[model samples]
Target: MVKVKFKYKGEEKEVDTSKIKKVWRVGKMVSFTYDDNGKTGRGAVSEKDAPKELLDMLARAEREKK
Candidate 1:
């Protein structure tokens, strides 16, 4: 399965699109949470560097929240 990999500060991680729970845009960063193993994982990526897939998810989530 493909994953969205990125680095924030010095930490690097990946997120699965199918497992994404919620996505929100705050300032210029896109923050999100997803199911990881038995727990929830969260991360933030700058809007400029975030992939189109994740951005789409953010857009959809934002629309639903308001």
Candidate 2:
């Protein structure tokens, strides 16, 4: 299982990427949109299964402000 960590509203949270093991399903979607230093960025995860590298990338993005 892959774990993706992200920070939201000054809090950190993690989700199991393996839980999104399907395509074309709402359950397989995860969205995060945030603004940092006046710049806004949005990220979405939608894959049959998230790879560890992808999860790590998301984590880093989430922690960019930290």
Candidate 3:
């Protein structure tokens, strides 16, 4: 099975896109909100557009949610 992988975790760590909050694209970038370990944050990078892989990752996670 193929999956989206994070590059900064040293060993290996997969992001649970299902646990994240989804935000609509504000112009050209895809945004998302996350909360963990008492920290709250938001992220979105400016680019031509959002990647297809990331969109699917979140969709797949949500579809598999119990």
Q: Which candidate is the best by lDDT?
A: 1
Per-candidate TM-scores read 0.69, 0.27, 0.43
Point to the candidate with the largest TM-score: 1
Candidate 1 has a TM-score of 0.69
User: Model 1 scores what on Cα lDDT?
Assistant: 0.73
Q: Write the per-residue lDDT of candidate 2 for residues 6-63, one digit (tens) a residue.
A: 5445565444443423222234454544445555544455544455655464546545
TM-score, prediction 2: 0.27
Off by over 4 Å in 1: 7-11, 63-66
Runs off by more than 4 Å, candidate 3: 1-14, 45-53, 57-66
lDDT of 3 at 13: 34
State each model's CA lDDT, in order.
0.73, 0.47, 0.47
Model 1 Cα lDDT, one tens digit per residue, 1-66: 347676534688777777777778775678777776667777778877777777777878777766
Worst 10 residues of 3 by lDDT: 1-10
